Structure formats: structure tokens, C-alpha cells
């Protein structure tokens, strides 16, 4: 991911090197190509437009038309714009003595696998997590998490078919108290598409369990479609943060570049592989540099 956009941006900027001062026409042409590169990377249209306008403002604010090294000013301005579009500053969920987080998303988003990856990540951080398979309709879905969780050395509590939210709360609360778990991760039911029934169940489970965080897992490869899912989930359930999976997937990187603008939700973690340790915090600044070939 980002490979296509990265090459287009690096080319647009590099082609200005060693040519002395550039004309306003050169700047406009450059800004247009950047906007086009973003658009072709499935970046939201409004975001792409706002992006080039910000770079334009900041570039002129640095007298790019006067600079003898315009390529450097453009790189510096695009870098800041990329960093901000990607989230600005790295963000992570606030940890308290006791925490209960919800993992929501569609089937195939990597939600379940991410739930297990998240448990391992915080386990290595000194936390004592407890995984909860909350799909009261799909036993096989619950078994998938138990296997994934126990494999990483994390306990997993499976809900029973048709079990009520109140019953789930009780059992989870007990197991957490007995095993002294400080981080409860609830893996909610995942379906191929958004269906009112499931959304209602999620909303209800949220009311009874009262999670302090609701992480929405999204397949970054779905591009802008992911932002549509985010809106639906936020409007019907209420999310606090996002997790973009398959960032290593061969696809455009428009989702990550539009998330902040479109959803207003921070991207906490990123999925970079299938392996259990294929999850790491999302670093806006670091990603911005990688896209511009800064290493």
C-alpha cells in the first residue's frame, strides 16, 4: 500500500530539483499533479482539494517562488500536510486501572484476529487482558477467537447462544475479578454487511457493558468504503478509535489519508501482517516520511 502514491509524489517533487527558481505555473502544475495523485489513491475528493490548498498556502508562506531550492520547500510542506492528514500526532487508547473495550467491524475486516493481536500487544506491556467472544449466534466465530487467544497465551471467555447482555456482563465481571484481568477486550459479532438487527444488538451490548473505548477495525484495502462503514458504525453504535488492517495489502492508501477529515476518529493501531505480532501503533509522522521516501 502507498507504493503507487509514494512514487507519484516523490516524482512530482524530485522533478523540481536542480532547476533553480520555479514559476507560479510550475507550482500550480505541481499542486495539480499532487491532487491527482491523491485522487488516484482513492483519497476523498474534499480531502485531496483541502490538502493541495494547505500545501499551497504554506508553500507561499515560505516564499517558495523566491527559494532557490523549491523542491525542499514543497517536500517540507507536503510532509507536514501528509502528517496532519494522517492524524497529526500518534494516539493510543487511555489505559486505566480497569478497562473494557469493544472491537467492532465487518466480517473480513480482521476484527477477530486483531482482537487477539491487541491482547498480546498489551500483554507484553504488563497488562492482564481477557478476550471475550460475544457473538451469540455463531459458535464457530467464538471458537475462532478462543483458538487465536489461547494461542497467544490470553484467556478467552465465550458467550452462550442467545445469552443476554446482563448475563454476559456478570460472567465477564466474575472471570475478570477472579483472574484479576485489567483489560477486557470484547470481540463483537461480525457480518459481511451492515444489518440493522446486529447494530441494535451492538448498541444494547454497549449500554450494558459500558466500554470505555469502541475500536472499529477496518480493512484498509477497501479504501473509501472503509470510511462509509465507519460512519454507519459511529452513527448506530458510537466509535472512539479505528484500527486499519492490511496496511501491507497491495492497494491504494486513501483510507488512512482521509480518516481524520472524514470520520474525525483517530487511528490507534495498524495491521501490517497476518502474524500475531503484525500489529503496531499508528504513527502519522513516520508514515508521512515513508510515503515521501525519507526512510
Ligand X SMILES: Nc1nc2c(ncn2[C@@H]2O[C@H](COP(=O)(O)OP(=O)(O)NP(=O)(O)O)[C@@H](O)[C@H]2O)c(=O)[nH]1
Task: Give the residue numbers of the binding site.
Answer: 105-112, 187-191, 245-248
The nearer residue to ligand X, 10 or 107, going by C-beta atoms, is: 107
Instruction: Report if residue 179 touches ligand X, rule: CB under 6 A.
Output: no
In 3D, which of 19, 16, 13, 18 has the Cα closest to residue 34? Answer: 13
Residue 232 CB burial class (10 angstroms; 0-12, 13-18, ≥19): middle
The nearer residue to ligand X, 246 or 260, going by C-beta atoms, is: 246
Contact flags string 274-293 toward ligand X, x per CB under 6 A: x---x---------------
For the segment 49-88, give every residue that binds ligand X (CB under 6 A): none
Give the side-chain half-sphere CA count within 13 A for 216. 27
Q: State the binding site for GTP.
A: 105-112, 187-191, 245-248
At its nearest, how many Å lie between ligand X and the CB of residue 215? 13
d(CA 52, CA 55): 5
User: Candidates 47-55, 84-92, 111-119, 203-211 — which segment interacts with ligand X by CB under 6 A?
Assistant: 111-119
Select from 70, 87, 129, 190 the one that contacts ligand X (CB under 6 A): 190
Residue matched to cell numbers 446486529:
198
The nearer residue to ligand X, 13 or 185, going by C-beta atoms, is: 185
In 3D, which of 267, 279, 247 has the Cα closest to residue 148? Answer: 279
d(CA 73, CA 94): 36
Residue 132 CB burial class (10 angstroms; 0-12, 13-18, ≥19): buried
Q: Is 117 within 8 Å of 87 (Cβ atoms)?
A: no
The nearer residue to ligand X, 56 or 111, going by C-beta atoms, is: 111
Q: Where are the beta strands (DSSP E) in the chain?
A: 99-104, 129-133, 156-158, 183-187, 213-219, 241-245, 267-271, 279-281
Select from 169, 199, 273, 285 the one that contacts ligand X (CB under 6 A): 273
Instruction: Report if residue 222 touches ligand X, rule: CB under 6 A.
Output: no
Select from 35, 56, 246, 252 the one that contacts ligand X (CB under 6 A): 246
User: Candidates 73-81, 118-126, 242-250, 284-292 — which segment interacts with ligand X by CB under 6 A?
Assistant: 242-250
At its nearest, how many Å lie between ligand X and the CB of residue 272? 6
Instruction: Report if residue 253 touches ligand X, rule: CB under 6 A.
Output: no
Q: Which residues sit at the interface with ligand X, rule CB under 6 A? A: 107-113, 190, 245-246, 248, 271-274, 278
Amino acid at each position: 500500500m502507498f507504493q503507487q502514491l509514494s512514487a507519484r509524489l516523490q516524482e512530482a517533487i524530485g522533478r523540481l530539483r536542480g532547476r533553480g527558481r520555479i514559476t507560479e505555473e510550475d507550482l500550480k502544475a505541481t499542486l495539480r499533479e499532487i491532487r491527482r495523485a491523491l485522487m488516484d489513491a482513492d483519497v476523498n475528493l474534499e480531502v485531496a482539494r483541502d490538502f493541495v490548498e494547505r500545501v499551497r498556502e504554506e508553500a507561499l508562506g515560505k516564499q517558495v517562488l523566491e527559494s532557490l531550492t523549491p523542491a525542499e520547500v514543497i517536500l517540507a510542506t507536503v510532509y507536514e500536510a501528509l502528517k496532519e492528514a494522517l492524524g497529526g500526532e500518534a494516539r493510543l487508547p487511555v489505559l486505566k486501572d480497569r478497562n473494557l473495550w469493544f472491537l467492532v467491524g465487518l466480517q473480513g475486516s480482521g476484527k477477530t484476529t486483531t482482537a487477539a493481536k491487541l491482547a498480546l500487544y498489551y500483554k507484553g506491556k504488563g497488562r492482564r487482558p481477557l478476550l471475550v467472544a460475544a457473538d451469540t449466534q455463531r459458535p464457530a466465530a467464538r471458537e475462532q477467537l478462543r483458538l487465536l487467544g489461547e494461542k497467544v497465551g490470553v484467556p478467552v471467555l465465550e458467550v452462550m447462544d442467545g445469552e443476554s447482555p446482563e448475563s454476559i456482563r456478570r460472567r465477564v465481571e466474575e472471570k475478570a475479578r477472579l483472574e484479576a484481568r485489567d483489560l477486557i477486550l470484547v470481540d463483537t459479532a461480525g457480518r459481511l454487511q451492515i444489518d440493522e438487527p446486529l447494530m441494535g444488538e451492538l448498541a444494547r451490548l454497549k449500554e450494558v457493558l459500558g466500554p470505555d473505548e469502541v475500536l472499529l477495525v477496518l480493512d484498509a484495502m477497501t479504501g473509501q468504503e472503509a470510511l462509509s462503514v465507519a460512519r454507519a458504525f459511529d452513527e448506530k453504535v458510537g466509535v472512539t478509535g479505528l484500527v486499519l488492517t492490511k496496511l501491507d495489502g497491495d492497494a491504494r492508501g486513501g483510507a488512512a489519508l482521509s480518516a481524520r477529515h472524514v470520520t474525525g476518529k483517530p487511528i490507534y493501531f495498524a495491521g501490517v501482517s497476518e502474524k500475531p505480532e503484525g500489529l503496531e501503533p499508528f504513527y502519522p509522522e513516520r508514515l508521512a516520511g515513508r510515503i515521501l521516501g525519507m526512510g
